[PDB]
Amino acid sequence: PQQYGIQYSASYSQQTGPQQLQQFQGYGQQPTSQA
Amino acid sequence: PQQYGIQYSASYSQQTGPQQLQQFQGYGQQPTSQA
Amino acid sequence: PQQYGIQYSASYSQQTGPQQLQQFQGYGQQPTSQA
Amino acid sequence: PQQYGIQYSASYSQQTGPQQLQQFQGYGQQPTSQA
Amino acid sequence: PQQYGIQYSASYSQQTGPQQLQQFQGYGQQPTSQA
Amino acid sequence: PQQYGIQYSASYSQQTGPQQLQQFQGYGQQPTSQA
Amino acid sequence: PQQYGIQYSASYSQQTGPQQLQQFQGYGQQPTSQA
Amino acid sequence: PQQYGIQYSASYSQQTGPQQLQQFQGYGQQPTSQA
Amino acid sequence: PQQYGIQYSASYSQQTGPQQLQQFQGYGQQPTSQA
Amino acid sequence: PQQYGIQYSASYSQQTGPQQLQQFQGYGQQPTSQA
Amino acid sequence: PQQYGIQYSASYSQQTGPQQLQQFQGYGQQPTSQA
Amino acid sequence: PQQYGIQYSASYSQQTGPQQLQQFQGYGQQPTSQA
Amino acid sequence: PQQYGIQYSASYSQQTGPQQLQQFQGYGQQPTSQA
Amino acid sequence: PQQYGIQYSASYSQQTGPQQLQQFQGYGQQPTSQA
Amino acid sequence: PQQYGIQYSASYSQQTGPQQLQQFQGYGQQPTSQA
Amino acid sequence: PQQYGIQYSASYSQQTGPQQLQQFQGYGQQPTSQA
Amino acid sequence: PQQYGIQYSASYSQQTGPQQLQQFQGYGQQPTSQA
Amino acid sequence: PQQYGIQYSASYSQQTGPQQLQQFQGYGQQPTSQA
Amino acid sequence: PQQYGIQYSASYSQQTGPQQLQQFQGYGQQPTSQA
Amino acid sequence: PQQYGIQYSASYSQQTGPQQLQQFQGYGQQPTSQA
């Protein structure tokens, strides 16, 4: 099992804003609750 | 099992706004609740 | 099993707004509840 | 089993608004409930 | 089994509004309920 | 089994409004209920 | 089994309104209920 | 079995209103009920 | 078995109103009920 | 078995109103009931 | 001067196809030309 | 001068296809030209 | 001068397809040209 | 001069597809050109 | 001059697809050109 | 001059897809060009 | 001159996808060009 | 001149995806160019 | 001249993803170029 | 001239992801270039 978020190869990246990368491998849970 | 979010190859990327990448491999749950 | 979100090859990308990429491989659940 | 969201090859992309890409491979459920 | 969302080849894309791409491969369910 | 949403080849695309592409391959269900 | 939503070849596309493309390959159900 | 929604070849398309393309290949059901 | 919705070849299309294309290949059912 | 909805060849089309194209190939049923 | 497109009062509406409603109040012109 | 597109009062609406509502109040022009 | 697109009062709405509402009040022009 | 796009009052809305609302008040022009 | 896009009053809204609301008040122009 | 995009009053909103709201008050221009 | 994007009053909001709000008051221009 | 992006009053907000708010008051220009 | 990005009053906010707020008051320019 | 980014009054804020607030008052320029 291989998991790759972002890959660049001879490329140009310009990122001016906010960026979020969340990875779960296996048994991942992301619960959000607002009571 | 291979999972790839974004791939660039000899490319140009300009990203000025917000960006979110969430990966789940295996057994992933993303529950959202508002009671 | 291969899963690819976005691929660029000798391309030009300009992204000025918000962007969301969510990947589930295997057994993925995205429940949303509003009681 | 191969799954590809978006592919660019020697192309030009300009995306000014919001963009959502959600992928499920295998056994994916996206339930939305409003009680 | 191959699944392709959008493909560009030597093309020009300008997308100014909101865009949604949801892929299900295998056994996918998208239920929406409003009680 | 191959499934292709949209294909461009040496073409020009200008999309100013909202766009939705939903793909189901295999055993896909999209139920909508309003009780 | 091949399924193609929209194909462009050396063409010009201008789309100013809302657009929906839903594909089912295999065993697809789109039930809508209003009780 | 091949299924093609819309094809353009050296053509010009201008679409200003809403557009819906729904494809079913195999065993597709689109029931609508209003009780 | 081949099924083609609309084909353009060196043509000009201007579509200002709403447009619906629904394809069923194989065993397709479109029941509408109002009790 | 080939099924063609509409074909254009070096033609000019201007469509200002609503348009519906429904295709059934194989074993298609379109029942409408009002009890 | 009052102009009403469609009115429902304790009624049940099921609309499965495309629908277009265009209203002009005052001095409205809808010319269509194909030269 | 009052202009009303669609009105619902204690009613049930189920709309499964594409829908377009364009309103002009005052001095509205909707010309379409294909040269 | 009052302009109302759609009004709901104690009603139930289920809209599964694409929907477009464009309003012009005053001096509105919507020209479409394809040369 | 008052302009209202959509109004809900004690109502239930379920919208599963793409939706576009464009308002112009005063002196609004929406020209679309494809040369 | 008052302009209201969408209003909810004691209502329930469930929106699962893409949504676009563009407002112009005063002297607004939305030209789209594809040369 | 008052301009209101979306208003909620004692309401429930569930929005699962992409959403775009663009407001122009005064003298606003949104030109899109693809040469 | 008052401009309001979104207003909530004793309401419940659940937003799971991407969201874009752009406001221009006065003399605002949003040109997009792809040469 | 008052400009308000989003307002909450005794409300509940749950935002799980990316969000962008851009305000221009006075003389604002947002040009995007891709040569 | 007053400019307000987001306001909360006796409210509950839960923000799990990326968020961008850009304000320009006076004479603001946000040009993006990709040559 | 007053400029306010975010205001909280007797409120609860939970922010789990990345957040960006950029303010320009007077004569502000945010150019982004990728040659």
Numbering used by the authors:
A (entry chain S), B (entry chain O), C (entry chain K), D (entry chain G), E (entry chain C), F (entry chain B), ...: 265 to 299
Give sentences from the paper:
TFG functions in the early secretory pathway by regulating the transport of secretory vesicles between the endoplasmic reticulum (ER) and ER–Golgi intermediate compartments (ERGICs). Within this region is an LCD (residues 237–327) rich in proline, tyrosine, and glutamine that functions to further polymerize these octamers into larger assemblies and phase-separate. Mutations in the TFG LCD are associated with degenerative neurological disorders such as Charcot–Marie–Tooth disease type 2 (CMT2) and hereditary motor and sensory neuropathy with proximal dominant involvement (HMSN-P).
The mC-TFG-LCD-P285L fibrils have two distinct polymorphs: a narrow, untwisting fibril (making up the minority of fibrils) whose structure could not be determined, and the major polymorph, which consists of two identical protofilaments related by a pseudo 21 screw axis, forming a class 1 zipper interface (parallel, face-to-face, up-up packing). The fibril has a pitch of 877 Å, a left-handed helical twist of 179.02°, and a helical rise of 2.39 Å. The disease-relevant mutation P285L is present and buried in the protofilament interior. L285 is a member of the longest β-strand of the protofilament core, fills in the space left by the glycine residue across from it, and forms a hydrophobic interaction with I270. Water molecules resolved in the interior of the fiber core reveal that L285 forms a barrier between solvent-accessible surface area and a glutamine zipper. The shape difference of the 269–285 segment also contributes to the presence or absence of Y291–A299 in the resolved fibril core. This is due to the fact that, in the mC-TFG-LCD-P285L structure, residues T296–Q298 form a short polar zipper with residues Q278–T280 on the opposite protofilament. For the mC-TFG-LCD-P285L fibrils, fibrous aggregates were visible up to 80°C and disappeared only at 90°C, although even at 60°C, the fibrils appeared bristly.
